[PDB]
Design an enzyme around this catalytic site. Structure first.
Site, PDB file in Angstrom:
ATOM      1  N   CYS A   1       1.044  -1.118   0.101  1.00  0.00           N
ATOM      2  CA  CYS A   1      -0.079   0.018   0.058  1.00  0.00           C
ATOM      3  C   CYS A   1       1.005   1.132   0.000  1.00  0.00           C
ATOM      4  O   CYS A   1       1.995   1.189   0.648  1.00  0.00           O
ATOM      5  CB  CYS A   1      -1.071  -0.148   1.207  1.00  0.00           C
ATOM      6  SG  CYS A   1      -1.609   1.635   1.610  1.00  0.00           S
TER       7      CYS A   1
HETATM    8  C1  LIG Z   1      -4.575   1.899  -0.267  1.00  0.00           C
HETATM    9  S1  LIG Z   1      -4.413   0.363   0.497  1.00  0.00           S
HETATM   10  O1  LIG Z   1      -4.544  -0.820  -0.384  1.00  0.00           O
HETATM   11  C2  LIG Z   1      -6.162   0.600   1.407  1.00  0.00           C
HETATM   12  C3  LIG Z   1      -6.312  -0.279   2.810  1.00  0.00           C
HETATM   13  C4  LIG Z   1      -7.579  -0.011   3.494  1.00  0.00           C
HETATM   14  N1  LIG Z   1      -8.414   1.241   2.695  1.00  0.00           N
HETATM   15  C5  LIG Z   1      -7.390   0.444   4.976  1.00  0.00           C
HETATM   16  O2  LIG Z   1      -7.653   1.537   5.335  1.00  0.00           O
HETATM   17  O3  LIG Z   1      -6.933  -0.521   5.779  1.00  0.00           O
END
Ligand SMILES: C[S@](=O)CC[C@H](N)C(=O)O
Length: 205
Positions: free
Chosen positions: A11
Site C-alpha cells: 500500500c
Molecule cells: C491503499 S490500501 O490498499 C487501502 C487499505 C484500506 N483502505 C485500509 O484503510 O486499511
C-alpha cells in the site's frame, strides 16, 4: 530538472510518508504502474501495482540510497501474484537497472534469502486519486487546511516539499526539530510560521 525513481512495495500511504521524510526527496506522488491498462484507478486497477513516484535531487541523495530505504521498508522474501501489492522497482534507465540488480544481489548475499522484487522497465505511471495523496496530512484537518491555503490549493500543496515532510511528520517518520528546519526553508511570513508551528507542536503534544 530533477531525477525520478518509481517503486512499488505494498500500500502506498506508508511509502509516501517514509520517502517524503528524507532529505533530498523534493516531492512524492502515489499512483499506479506496472500493468497494461491506460488510466487505471482505485476501483479499476487492472494488473497495476500501488506505486510511488519519488522526485529527488541527485546532488543531495543518490538512487542507491533510495533503493536502500526501499529495501528497509519491506522484506520481499516471498513470491506472490497479488499485483496490487507486489514489490517492484521500475527503472527509468540502464544505470537504475544495474544499481537495483547489484543491490538486490548484495542483499541476497548478506541475509541469505532470495528477494522477489521484480526489476522492470518503467512503462507508464498513472497518478492516484486526490484522496490518496499525502494521506496522513490530508486527514489532519486543521494543519491541512492551513497549509493548503498557504500553498494556494490542493495541487500546489501535495506537489510541495513541505507537504511531503509534514505528511511524514504526522506518520511518525520525522522529528519536530527536522520539520522546523524544513519550515524555515520555505520562509513563511512570521504569523503563518507561528500558526503552523503551534499546530505542529500541539500534534507533538
Ligand atoms: C491503499 S490500501 O490498499 C487501502 C487499505 C484500506 N483502505 C485500509 O484503510 O486499511
Amino acid at each position: 530538472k530533477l531525477s525520478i525513481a518509481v517503486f512499488a512495495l505494498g500500500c502506498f500511504w506508508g511509502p509516501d510518508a517514509q520517502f517524503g521524510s528524507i532529505k533530498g526527496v523534493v516531492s512524492t506522488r502515489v499512483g499506479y504502474a506496472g500493468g497494461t491498462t491506460n488510466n487505471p484507478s482505485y476501483y479499476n486497477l487492472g494488473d497495476h501495482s500501488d506505486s510511488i513516484e519519488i522526485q529527488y535531487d541527485a546532488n543531495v541523495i543518490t538512487y542507491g540510497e533510495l533503493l536502500n530505504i526501499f529495501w528497509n521498508l519491506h522484506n520481499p522474501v516471498y513470491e506472490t501474484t497479488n499485483r496490487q501489492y507486489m514489490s517492484r522497482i521500475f527503472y527509468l534507465d540502464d544505470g537504475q537497472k544495474s544499481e537495483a540488480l547489484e543491490m538486490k544481489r548484495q542483499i541476497e548475499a548478506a541475509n541469505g534469502e532470495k528477494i522477489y522484487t521484480e526489476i522492470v522497465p518503467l512503462e507508464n505511471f498513472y497518478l492516484a486519486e486526490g484522496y490518496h495523496q499525502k494521506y496522513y496530512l490530508q486527514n489532519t484537518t486543521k494543519l491541512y487546511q492551513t497549509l493548503k491555503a498557504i500553498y494556494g490549493g490542493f495541487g500546489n500543496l501535495v506537489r510541495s516539499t513541505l507537504a511531503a515532510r509534514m505528511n511524514g511528520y504526522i506518520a511518525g517518520n520525522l522529528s519536530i526539530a527536522s520539520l522546523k528546519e524544513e519550515m524555515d526553508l520555505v520562509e513563511l511570513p512570521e504569523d503563518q510560521y507561528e500558526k503552523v508551528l503551534s499546530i505542529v507542536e500541539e500534534i507533538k503534544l
